Design a binder for these strands. Sequence first.
RNA 1: CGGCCCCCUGGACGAAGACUGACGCUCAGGUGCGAAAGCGUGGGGAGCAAACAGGAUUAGAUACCCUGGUAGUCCACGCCGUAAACGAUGUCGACUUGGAGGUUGUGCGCGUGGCUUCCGGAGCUAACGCGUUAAGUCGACCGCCUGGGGAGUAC
RNA 2: CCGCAGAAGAAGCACCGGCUAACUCCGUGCCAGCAGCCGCGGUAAUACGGAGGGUGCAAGCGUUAAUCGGAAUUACUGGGCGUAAAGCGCACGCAGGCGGUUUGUUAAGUCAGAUGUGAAAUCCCCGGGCUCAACCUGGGAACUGCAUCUGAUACUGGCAAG
RNA 3: AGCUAGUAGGUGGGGUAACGGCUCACCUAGGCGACGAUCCCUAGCUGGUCUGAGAGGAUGACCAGCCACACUGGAACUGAG
Lengths: 111, 129, 157, 160, 78
Amino acid sequence: ATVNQLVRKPRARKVAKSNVPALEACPQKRGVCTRVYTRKVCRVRLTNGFEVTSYIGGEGHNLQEHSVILIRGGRVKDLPGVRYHTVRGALDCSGVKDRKQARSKYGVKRP
Amino acid sequence: SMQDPIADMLTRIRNGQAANKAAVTMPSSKLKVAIANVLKEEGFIEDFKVEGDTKPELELTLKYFQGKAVVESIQRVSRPGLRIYKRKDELPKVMAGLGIAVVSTSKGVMTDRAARQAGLGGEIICYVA
Amino acid sequence: ELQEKLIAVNRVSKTVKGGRIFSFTALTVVGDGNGRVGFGYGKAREVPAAIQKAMEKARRNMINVALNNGTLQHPVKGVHTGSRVFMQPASEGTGIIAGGAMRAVLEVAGVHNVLAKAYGSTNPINVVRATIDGLENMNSPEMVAAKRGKSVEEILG
Amino acid sequence: PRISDYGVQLREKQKVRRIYGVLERQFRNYYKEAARLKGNTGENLLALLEGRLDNVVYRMGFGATRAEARQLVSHKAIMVNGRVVNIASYQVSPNDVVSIREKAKKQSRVKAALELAEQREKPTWLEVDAGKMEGTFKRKPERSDLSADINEHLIVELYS
Amino acid sequence: IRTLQGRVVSDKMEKSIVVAIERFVKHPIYGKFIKRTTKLHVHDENNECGIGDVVEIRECRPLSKTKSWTLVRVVEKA
RNA sequence: CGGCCCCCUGGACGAAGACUGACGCUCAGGUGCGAAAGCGUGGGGAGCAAACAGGAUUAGAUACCCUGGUAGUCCACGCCGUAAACGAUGUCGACUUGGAGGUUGUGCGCGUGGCUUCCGGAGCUAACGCGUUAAGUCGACCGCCUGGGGAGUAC
RNA sequence: CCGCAGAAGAAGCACCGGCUAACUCCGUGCCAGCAGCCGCGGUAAUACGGAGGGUGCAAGCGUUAAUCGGAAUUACUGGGCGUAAAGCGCACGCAGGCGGUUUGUUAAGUCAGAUGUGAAAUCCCCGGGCUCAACCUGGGAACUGCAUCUGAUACUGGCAAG
RNA sequence: AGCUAGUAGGUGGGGUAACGGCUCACCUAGGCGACGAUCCCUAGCUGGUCUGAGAGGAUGACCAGCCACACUGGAACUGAG
Ligand SMILES: [Mg+2]
């Protein structure tokens, strides 16, 4: 239908924005875990300074306020503006101890 | 202003079959009497006549079978704003051969089966089922 | 040799001055081994009672239609209450390719080679009514030859 | 407890996987080549699964267990056209020749198991001989000669 | 001989002719036949054309910048 | 857009006779008109009445109620291009059961046209409903849509 | 290829309320925590953690990131605009798209036939050797798209015209 | 949303392996453009890969065909290139 108008102005397919709007086409990106407290979030300035919010899971609240961490993409569905998750088990990020189940989660070593 | 007399004839006979009328009159033309002749040859109507001299009138009577319309779906596939031309090898099979389609080809007016058996294609205009 | 396949169980709820009265509705289609299909929409306060009511309704309204060795005579388009379904014949080595409700109703009808796709809405009652109306509107070469006045050999070629 | 159609589909699938000792990716490639294959898919896939080398050794009778059959195949005790085959997924062509290695002639436990299998059942194809340690393929496996408790429709719908 | 037929636009170029041809092409994604006014530069002999006349064009060796065309026949007599 | 009259003038419709012989339809851009409010200049200003003041109910009332009253509402010349500018239904055509009517003609006490109101058959939608003035079947073209807020918002 | 030896040295990953495959016990009291979605924690959480078992995969298994489909969710095939998003406030008008009916002619669009041309590898089919397979390889087909020549005139184009 | 002045063409000369505003001198006053000129952003292209019932969409590493480049920017010599 309306083929004259369609050939005058072509049908433009709608763009699709990424759910992770910071450092796209990258699975894990680095950053400095500034403000590791309030209430379980870090304000992470990444390798280019996109300044995302990230959620910390498990133990390790004594992580350094200037600590190199890795960030993966994930929405928590419980807090506003939290669209990123800390990758527990990466470099300078102490894995959650006393968690012997879900080994791939938190980067815990088994005995 | 009317821009498609063939489509006007098709929608006239379609709503006439929907209303269960007896006969329908319309202005005439060469392609109109040709498509009426090939429709009668395919066997969807009984007959059609031409009345008058200065204004030719194609008076045609409709067909009904068991209290139902003989035709079910008539659709103009070659619109006057969107023409359709398909070659012989890609001629469609309306309802896998159960329906029919009119094709205006180089040897006059015929159907899809007649075009396949003659060996040439053209502007496929309407689907009748 | 009839078959038994339920396709939809829902929990409706009405409101009364005392509170809420919950009820169970059951859509279930049945049919014979070839051609005759019928769907039933029962509603009660108990699940097996609603199932049996839907079964009796379907056995009452079991409609009849023909086919051609486990496939459609021609591609049909079933449109009803906002549900577009596309019934299309297939080759022998295909099987039954349809949705959930369409796959169930075609496996009940007993076809062997039918490809299909359900557009529009995804309501089970609407898609089963759409495919029933499509199968009912589907005609046969013998009846179209009797309606056009020609023979089956003239209509096949 | 009663699971639905998808559940019983995956239950029959894992039942076939357990009774044949076949992993999931192997059966997935089996389904791929079966859908590539001509004619039907499910029963031809069952014919291919019967044409599995460990299954063909078990049903010829050189071992009454597919585990020890795979052990013997890995130890290269089956000579087709004189040459050994270590790979358990080798397909056997019809009217071929298979033989047992001379080092595998020191065999008593699986020979008594072959006698037990002769006491149990006797199929149509897969002519076997305990003395000469030889064997050949008669013809294709029949769909009726195929055993029971196998359904192809739910399998091809689960993997379709 | 592979000549084409076209229509000129202007003839005020001091022994140079700008022609324009039209073609009906089926749209590859829409199917509606549209027009394509392809304009070309043609070299003539002694200005044997006017404004808006139908002529025939032939491809030849390059004679100027993006002008490798010569006039064959004029079927309008302008 | 309605007190009457005069003058100037547009459009519509009807029954017939003659002539031009497709001069036709939508229109992106452009042009014109375009309710009320408001703006500029010059007038006028009875009544109404934004703003504002006072008195009242009220816990408070910057509101709904009264007392007054500026702008505006009135005229002329130019802007203002916005409305729930709606029939929430773009324009031009063809065909497809009927009742109840209204207005306005023309022809033979009756026939056929133009516009319009209400309900309903088929048909169409999710239903409400539309239904010969279709939201039925179609044909031509333009405009607009594609989750809400942000937002008809910033540059 | 041949021997030898103590099976000798050779196994984990995710999940068990549902979608989606499979359960109990203890800690636990909106607390730590889980979570793709519905979302869970009311001193009894089949949903957090620990124990067993089972489930699924297997030298891999979970998570993240990127693309297509599902999505008819940009609809040519394959949608709408009365009330859900969506008919410009209305009219006139240029380019442009469409054009009532018949004759003569052109084949520009249209179709038919023929020829040349679409590198080679992938892709589909028939075979071969890699212990089978992955891999590579021979033949056929596909690459139907493009260009040139000869014919047709039903229709859409143009002119002469009624 | 207008752009272009060697711009578009012609005549004569030069030069290039080779036609040609390629380059000069003189004339003509034009050429392109809502079928998108000009400007801005992005980007090597194709056979192909993935996905899709199809039509399509995304994507050009490793395998090949073509183009461009060798810190950046200008050039020319040798050489058939
Ligand atoms: Mg007052």
